[PDB]
Amino acid sequence: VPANSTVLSFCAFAVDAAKAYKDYLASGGQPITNCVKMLCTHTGTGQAITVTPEANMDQESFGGASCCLYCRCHIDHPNPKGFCDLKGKYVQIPTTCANDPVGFTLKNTVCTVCGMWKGYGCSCDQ
Amino acid sequence: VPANSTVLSFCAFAVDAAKAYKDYLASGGQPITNCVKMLCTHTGTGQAITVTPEANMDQESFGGASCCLYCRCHIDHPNPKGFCDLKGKYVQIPTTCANDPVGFTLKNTVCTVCGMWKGYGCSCDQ
Amino acid sequence: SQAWQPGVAMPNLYKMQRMLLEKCDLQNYGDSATLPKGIMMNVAKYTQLCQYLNTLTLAVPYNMRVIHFGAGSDKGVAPGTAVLRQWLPTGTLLVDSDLNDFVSDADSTLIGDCATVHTANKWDLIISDMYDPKTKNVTKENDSKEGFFTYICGFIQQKLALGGSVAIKITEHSWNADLYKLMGHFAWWTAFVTNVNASSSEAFLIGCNYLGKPREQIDGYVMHANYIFWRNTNPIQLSSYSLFDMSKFPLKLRGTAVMSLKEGQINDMILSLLSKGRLIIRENNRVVISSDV
Amino acid sequence: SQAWQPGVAMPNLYKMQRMLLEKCDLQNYGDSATLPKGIMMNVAKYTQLCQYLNTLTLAVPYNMRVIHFGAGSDKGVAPGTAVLRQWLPTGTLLVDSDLNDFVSDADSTLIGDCATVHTANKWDLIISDMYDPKTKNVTKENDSKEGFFTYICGFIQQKLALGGSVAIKITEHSWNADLYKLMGHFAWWTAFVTNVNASSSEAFLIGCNYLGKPREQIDGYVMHANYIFWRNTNPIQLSSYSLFDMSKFPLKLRGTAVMSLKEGQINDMILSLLSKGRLIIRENNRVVISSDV
RNA sequence: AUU
RNA sequence: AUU
Ligand SMILES: *OP(=O)(O)OP(=O)(O)OC[C@H]1O[C@@H](n2c[n+](C)c3c(=O)[nH]c(N)nc32)[C@H](O)[C@@H]1O
Ligand SMILES: *OP(=O)(O)OP(=O)(O)OC[C@H]1O[C@@H](n2c[n+](C)c3c(=O)[nH]c(N)nc32)[C@H](O)[C@@H]1O
Ligand SMILES: Nc1ncnc2c1ncn2[C@@H]1O[C@H](CSCC[C@H](N)C(=O)O)[C@@H](O)[C@H]1O
Ligand SMILES: Nc1ncnc2c1ncn2[C@@H]1O[C@H](CSCC[C@H](N)C(=O)O)[C@@H](O)[C@H]1O
Ligand SMILES: [Mg+2]
Ligand SMILES: [Mg+2]
Ligand SMILES: [Zn+2]
Ligand SMILES: [Zn+2]
Ligand SMILES: [Zn+2]
Ligand SMILES: [Zn+2]
């Protein structure tokens, strides 16, 4: 079978694809592969989701669509804004978590003030 | 003739070798060559003179001794401290000035507070 | 120094020959290059292609129109489209397309045979990476191929703005004589081989600054023979050095002037500006493109 | 992945052969590599040497003692010494030496023939880049060379601490049978060719963890013949990929234990600790070295 | 060998 | 051709 077909089908079948993927991961499943990592200078702002690659020395920049569970499963997005935040942009993933960018974008949230990943660059609270 | 022989002899002959080199440059002389540029990550502190290469994205790191006029001319140093600040260390030169590191270290001064080149990284005054 | 370039362009000396078609026999054929860790083959390939395009006189207008055929892949994603979107100025309309469904960062994604793509709008840049899988099948003679190439030759002639550019992927067996002939309708042209895939007969026919008329007469069969001869006699070592400095990668937005075509208004000043990447000639309304069959 | 390594080590398969000495005929002989802009050949070469040393079990004590022969150059500077100073832990005593005057970033610089260098102290790391210019002169047969090699063979046997290491540069014609034979007195050894100078017969004979006694019996003449055979039959492409990531370049200071030698105290546990880079055996007083003649 |  |  082609790569990722099983997990993408399993998630697309569920009513809550995010929960389906998180449960798949908690049972030891291999994370979704073939997220598109870009070449960049790694001297960027480090913000979470940007129009061009903005990885700093501790991040990797990926094509946004390839890191979106709903994009990858070809299912409708539940985003309250009515559109995807990732498709057409670039997502910065901490290098330690770059083995599962889809899981990272699912499990984390962007600070609406500074634009950094909450818990991975945002220091507004402290 | 070997490279730099003329200018190094001319500077070593004068009582004030720094003035001799600055006059040589002001008359259009080719700057001293073969300052030893190091490979580094360019993710360093950017300080002027350090024990390891500390170039940032706007600097290049050179072996300190090769960028010292007195070291290169094999003449005694006039440093009031009695020793050379460059020999045995690494000097960060702004990339725009990396064509003449000996001239740059001659013409510039290090902030004793923050350790940056005054006018090329020091923001203590402003 | 050649290993530090994004790739190698066909010298004019080899374009001017009149060779017979030979079988392609690359010294390093099939060899794989080691890329920066975790980088896809096509991210590297498209990055080198864009690095080379950076050295040409591409017109870069406000509200640029770029279309990318063959953007899908067996992985279900579109690395080439991601590189193009990184490269092109912000606000550039990027439309991509492929026979099979895929996920993309383009503004619109058109699924279906490229012949089902319809639009009234003209485009500023045409990138094609299309390749017919049946091309791999053994054949008696290496003849000019139709299929999508046919469509492509129509598109360039009908939907490419004057001053626009193209990069069309070809190989030893995936080529078309009329596309080579159309290359002579540009101010400049070449066949460009990326250094990361120099072990392949793949090249990109690059046409720079479309003139809409034959500036150079080109025999496509002879020219593909010339390309094969050049590849056979000039081996290229796999190299990915150019991928280590991305500081100058984004396409420089020069705000190229855009104007509408008038009846027989192409005076020599217009040809000059077109050939220097200083003018795009087309209408500039909202783009409407579809592959609905 | 060979192009991404700092260089290539002589396979064990080739050390165990019994070849006769032949002429070295490298396919790419003399070819020049393009290095990062403004980087000297020796900065690249010494950086790759240190990158390879990083993969071995070098003892790294507090107050390390490193000596570097052949550190001068026709440019009047010492790029290799600058790389060593970047690589070695802060506070490491670095002494270099050369026949001709030069400026260096080392703690002490000793000018004169290496045979004039005197010291009572033992050393933890010996780097030698020495090469006799007369080696270039045409000769009838490629015989074992004396000169500085003689001195070097004495130094290793008299002034190298147990557990210490060496890297001695040799070429097709600049070699010494006794140095090869001494390579068998280390826990591990190899001949290492940097990727940036793979078009040369130059290599570094690396001995890792000195044992002071023959662990492996080596015929130096036969082993140099084996090295030449390996170089002749295994061409290496020039490569500087490993130079693009310096983030893990510094030698890891692991605080290797230092102890003084006593009469017949070399039990097998001590050999175990020596062979893993876990022990340096020498005194640890202030170093006093000179070349005053 | 100091490309 | 999607190394
Ligand atoms: O991607 P390619 O470079 O293989 O070009 P292609 O797909 O158009 O060629 C199809 C078939 O030709 C055979 N073959 C092609 N080429 C260029 C070579 C070559 O250089 N050396 C050898 N030994 N065979 C070649 C392949 O079977 C290929 O599938
Ligand atoms: O630095 P080198 O690699 O030249 O080694 P060397 O100085 O010890 O050799 C001295 C002379 O030998 C001749 N020669 C050496 N090597 C290794 C080659 C070779 O590989 N291919 C040819 N055609 N000649 C070689 C040189 O004259 C060299 O100066
Ligand atoms: N007539 C046609 N119409 C549309 N797509 C076609 C086609 N003939 C071939 N193709 C497409 O050409 C593609 C070649 S694979 C291209 C890989 C892609 N450029 C990347 O970025 O990875 C295949 O996806 C195939 O479906
Ligand atoms: N017997 C000897 N004693 C000391 N130095 C010697 C020697 N024979 C050769 N040399 C030295 O060996 C050196 C080889 S050139 C070495 C270049 C140096 N590693 C660099 O970093 O650039 C020459 O400078 C030469 O003077
Ligand atoms: Mg060389
Ligand atoms: Mg290939
Ligand atoms: Zn999405
Ligand atoms: Zn915040
Ligand atoms: Zn000095
Ligand atoms: Zn200051």
Burial label for C160, CB within 10 Å (0-12, 13-18, 19+), is buried
Q: Do C3 and D34 touch (CB under 8 A)?
A: yes
Report residue C164 as tokens: 């626009």
Q: List the one residue out of D57, D59, D55 whose CA is nearest residue D7.
A: D55
In eight-state DSSP terms, residue A37 is B
Residue C38: what residue type?
G
Residue of A nearest to C89 (CA): A52
Residues 6+ apart with CB under 8 A from B113: B124
- What is the residue whose two structure tokens read 């020959």? C17
Give the H or E element holding residue D208. strand D203-210
Nearest to C103 among A3, A65, A98 (CB): A65
Q: Do D34 and C244 touch (CB under 8 A)?
A: no
Residues C5, C193: contact at Cβ < 8 Å?
no
Q: How far apart are CA C105 and CA D75, in angstroms?
A: 53
Confirm or deny that B35 is annotated as ligand binding. no
CB atoms within 10 A of CB D53: 20
Q: Which residues of C touch A74 (CB under 8 A)?
A: 101, 103
Q: List the one residue out of A25, A23, A43, A49 whose CA is nearest residue A105.
A: A49
- Strands C93-98 and C108-111 turn out to be parallel
Ligand 3 pocket member C73 (CB < 6 A): yes
Atom of ligand 1 at shortest distance to CA of C199?
Answer: 3
Q: List the one residue out of D48, D124, D107, D55 whose CA is nearest residue D83.
A: D48
Q: How far apart are CA C79 and CA C84, in angstroms?
A: 9
- In chain A, where does DSSP find H-type helix? 5-13, 17-26, 69-73, 101-107
- Strands C289-290 and C118-119 turn out to be antiparallel
- In chain C, where does DSSP find H-type helix? 12-15, 41-53, 79-87, 148-159, 177-183, 220-233, 268-275
Residues 6+ apart with CB under 8 A from A34: A3, A4, A66, C40, C75, C76, C77
Q: How far apart are CA A42 and CA A58, in angstroms?
A: 8
Expressed in angstroms and rounded, the spacing between residue C212 Cα and the centre of ligand 9 is 66
Burial label for D276, CB within 10 Å (0-12, 13-18, 19+), is middle
**CA-CA-CA-CA torsion for C214, C217, C220, C224, nearest 10 degrees?**
-120
- In D184-292, where does DSSP find H-type helix? 220-233, 268-275
For chain C, how far is it from start to end, CA to CA, in angstroms?
Answer: 49
- What is the residue whose two structure tokens read 């280590």? C244
Residue B8: what residue type?
L
Q: How far apart are CA C262 and CA D100, in angstroms?
A: 77
Residues A103, A21: contact at Cβ < 8 Å?
yes
Nearest to D3 among C1, C34, C244 (CB): C34
Distance A56 CA to E3 C1' (A): 35
Q: How far apart are CA D9 and CA D19, in angstroms?
A: 18
Q: How far apart are CA C239 and CA D244, in angstroms?
A: 14
Q: List the one residue out of C287, C279, C285 whose CA is nearest residue C254.
A: C279
**CA-CA-CA-CA torsion for D129, D130, D135, D136, nearest 10 degrees?**
50
Q: At what angle are helices A5-13 and A17-26 packed, to 10 degrees?
A: 130
Q: How far apart are CA D19 and CA D229, in angstroms?
A: 7
Burial label for D226, CB within 10 Å (0-12, 13-18, 19+), is buried
Burial pattern D235-250, b for ≥16 Cβ within 10 A else e, equals ebbbbbbbbeebeebe
Calculate the CA C190 to chain-centre distance. 10
In eight-state DSSP terms, residue D293 is -
Residues D167, D128: contact at Cβ < 8 Å?
yes
Residues D274, D211: contact at Cβ < 8 Å?
yes
Residues 6+ apart with CB under 8 A from A75: A11, A12, A17
Q: At what angle are helices B17-26 and B5-13 packed, to 10 degrees?
A: 130
- What is the residue whose two structure tokens read 């069969």? C221
Residues 6+ apart with CB under 8 A from B120: B94, B97, B108
Active-site annotation holds for C98: no
Residues B75, B90: contact at Cβ < 8 Å?
no
Residue C101: what residue type?
D
Residue of C nearest to A84 (CA): C105
Name the 3-class secondary structure at C116: helix
Give the H or E element holding residue D79. helix D79-87
Q: How far apart are CA C163 and CA C275, in angstroms?
A: 7
Q: List the one residue out of D246, A62, D245, D33 whose CA is nearest residue C239.
A: D33
- Asked whether residue D128, judged by its CB, lies under 7 Å from any atom of the DNA or RNA strand E, the reply is no
Q: At what angle are helices D79-87 and D41-53 packed, to 10 degrees?
A: 30
Q: List the one residue out of D56, D20, D57, D16 whose CA is nearest residue D217.
A: D16
In eight-state DSSP terms, residue C162 is E
Residues 6+ apart with CB under 8 A from C71: C78, C80, C81, C96, C97, C98, C102, C104, C106, C109, C129
Q: How far apart are CA D54 and CA D254, in angstroms?
A: 12
Q: List the one residue out of B33, B34, B85, B40 whose CA is nearest residue B58.
A: B40
- In C61-216, where does DSSP find H-type helix? 79-87, 148-159, 177-183
Q: How far apart are CA B101 and CA B91, in angstroms?
A: 9
Q: Looking at CA atoms only, how far is residue C31 from chain D in angstroms?
A: 12
Residues B48, B91: contact at Cβ < 8 Å?
yes
For chain B, how far is it from start to end, CA to CA, in angstroms?
Answer: 48
Domain range annotation of chain D:
1-293
Instruction: Please give the backbone phi and psi of residue D156, each rounded to the nearest 5 degrees, phi first.
Output: -50, -40
Give the H or E element holding residue D168. strand D160-170
Distance D71 CA to E2 C1' (A): 10
CB atoms within 10 A of CB B71: 21
Q: Which residues of C touch D241 (CB under 8 A)?
A: 34, 240-241
Distance D151 CA to E1 C1' (A): 18
- Asked whether residue D136, judged by its CB, lies under 7 Å from any atom of the DNA or RNA strand E, the reply is yes
Catalytic residue among C96, C98, C178, C202: C202
Technique employed here was X-ray
Give the H or E element holding residue D191. strand D186-194
Residues C178, C146: contact at Cβ < 8 Å?
no
Q: How far apart are CA D127 and CA D205, in angstroms?
A: 10
Q: How far apart are CA B40 and CA D249, in angstroms?
A: 9
Burial pattern C63-83, b for ≥16 Cβ within 10 A else e, equals ebbbbbbbbbbebbbbbbbbb
Report residue D247 as tokens: 């983030």
Report residue A103 as tokens: 């899981």
Residues B8, B66: contact at Cβ < 8 Å?
no
Residues 6+ apart with CB under 8 A from D140: none
Atom of ligand 1 at shortest distance to CA of C172?
Answer: 8
Q: List the one residue out of D170, D155, D150, D149 whose CA is nearest residue D125.
A: D155
Q: At what angle are helices C41-53 and C79-87 packed, to 10 degrees?
A: 30
Half-sphere exposure of C162 (CA within 13 A, CB side): 22
Active-site annotation holds for C45: yes
Q: List the one residue out of D244, D241, D39, D34 whose CA is nearest residue A41.
A: D244
Q: Do C4 and D237 touch (CB under 8 A)?
A: no
CB atoms within 10 A of CB C127: 25
Residues C228, C19: contact at Cβ < 8 Å?
yes
Residues 6+ apart with CB under 8 A from C161: C65, C122, C123, C124, C210, C280, C281, C282
Q: List the one residue out of D234, D214, D236 whose CA is nearest residue D226.
A: D234
Residue C40: what residue type?
M
Burial label for D223, CB within 10 Å (0-12, 13-18, 19+), is buried
- The verdict on A66 touching C (C-beta cutoff 8 Å) is yes
Q: Which long-range contacts (CB under 8 A, 24 or more apart) does B51-54 make?
A: B51/B89, B51/B90, B51/D90, B52/B90, B52/D86, B52/D90, B52/D250, B53/B90, B53/B92, B53/D86, B54/B90, B54/B92
Q: How far apart are CA D22 and CA D142, in angstroms?
A: 9
Q: Degrees (nearest 5) of the Cα angle D260, D264, D267?
A: 90
CATH number of the domain at C1-293, please?
3.40.50.150
**Rg value, chain D, Cα:** 18
Report residue D159 as tokens: 């002034």
For a mutational test of ligand 2's pocket, the pick from D28, D29, D233, i.e. the residue with the most ligand atoms closer than 8 A to its C-beta, is D29
Q: Degrees (nearest 5) of the Cα angle D138, D139, D140?
A: 135
Residues A48, A27: contact at Cβ < 8 Å?
no
Instruction: Please give the backbone phi and psi of residue A85, each rounded to the nearest 5 degrees, phi first.
Output: -80, -20
CB atoms within 10 A of CB D10: 21
Report residue A35 as tokens: 């997220």
Distance D167 CA to F1 C1' (A): 47
Q: Degrees (nearest 5) of the Cα angle B12, B18, B20?
A: 65
Q: List the one residue out of C58, C62, C67 whose CA is nearest residue C85.
A: C67
